[PDB]
């Protein structure tokens, strides 16, 4: 028990690994990878076709009972041909456990809406559509939720600029708020922070 180091909980790591292969055995048609991190979080990586079967099984199966959808988000990784990773974080009150289910998609491929499994997913999918442009099929009411009316683009994409492309002001001549190309009195100052020396050998990639 070194005072400044986070302790290891090996019992949880074993328990989550066992359940990890339990899910892989039952849904082999969809599960592509199962992993448990060093802080005991289980992630299930699935083919996108299995979003409804996998989520339904985790919610309904008597040995899972993941009744609460804590969070549903997306991550943009431009270097992948399927740049968007969709992440479901689920909570099981019966077994006091959490699980993460991950799938993928690209700009033109729809993902099945999981509202039929979790009613919570309604607004989360609208946010993903709004901020990333991922289309969810059979969504009851898919439209922007966070961005301005008529806003063009998907801001949370890595290649969308931080300050966007247009800004607003009030114009006295037309007596209304107008949108115009963005000019900054002070350009945002890009900082190059990364040290040129490797920090974590444990994560080194092969050359």
């Amino acid at each position: 028990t070194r005072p400044t180091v986070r302790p290891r909980n090996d019992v949880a790591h074993k328990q989550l690994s066992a359940f990890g292969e339990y899910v892989a055995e039952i849904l082999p048609k969809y599960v592509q990878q199962v992993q448990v991190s060093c802080f005991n979080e289980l992630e299930i990586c699935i083919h996108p076709d299995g979003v409804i079967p996998v989520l339904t099984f985790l919610r309904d199966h008597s040995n899972a009972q993941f009744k609460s959808l804590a969070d549903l988000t997306a991550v943009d990784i431009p270097t992948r041909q399927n740049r968007f990773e969709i992440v479901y974080n689920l909570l099981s009150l019966r077994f006091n456990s959490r699980i993460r289910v991950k799938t993928y998609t690209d700009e033109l491929t729809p993902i099945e809406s999981s509202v039929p499994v979790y009613k919570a997913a309604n607004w989360y999918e609208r946010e993903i559509w709004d901020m990333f442009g991922v289309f969810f099929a059979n969504h009851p009411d898919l439209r922007r939720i966070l961005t301005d009316y008529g806003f063009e683009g998907h801001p949370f994409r890595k290649d969308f600029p931080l300050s966007g492309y247009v800004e607003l002001r009030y114009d006295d001549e037309v007596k209304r708020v107008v949108a115009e190309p963005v000019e900054l009195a002070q350009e945002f100052r890009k900082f190059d922070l990364n040290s040129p020396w490797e920090a974590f050998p444990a994560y080194r990639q092969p050359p």
Binding site: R2, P3, T4, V5, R6, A12, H13, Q15, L16, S17, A18, F19, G20, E21, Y22, A24, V31, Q32, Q33, V34, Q35, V36, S37, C38, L42, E43, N63, A64, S92, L93, R94, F95, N96, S97, I99, A199, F200, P201, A202, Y203
Partner: protein, 94 residues
């Protein structure tokens, strides 16, 4: 604190409480606004020996996730079922 006796009685009666024991205005029970200087303790890594950083480096013990299954016997649950909560013995019913 400066209320007359009759006024203290009146508001005590109206509220049903003894309001003078727990006034919501602060008087002299609060700390002085000037204090003696502190002398704060040091941490467990403040030593001159037996203190090599490589033996107390939490970041370098973090590891990549264990791959349980990749695409390259009894049923289990993620954890044991949660134990049922017990009623409070302090005050079970409000």
């Amino acid at each position: 604190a400066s209320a007359t006796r009759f006024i203290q009685w009146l508001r005590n009666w109206a509220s049903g409480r003894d309001l003078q024991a727990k006034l919501q205005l602060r008087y002299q029970e609060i700390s002085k606004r000037t204090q003696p200087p502190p002398k704060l303790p040091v941490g467990p890594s403040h030593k001159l020996s037996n203190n090599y950083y490589c033996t107390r480096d939490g970041r370098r013990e973090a590891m990549p996730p264990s791959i349980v299954m990749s695409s390259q016997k009894k049923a289990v649950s993620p954890a044991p079922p949660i134990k049922r909560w017990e009623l409070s013995q302090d005050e079970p019913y409000l």
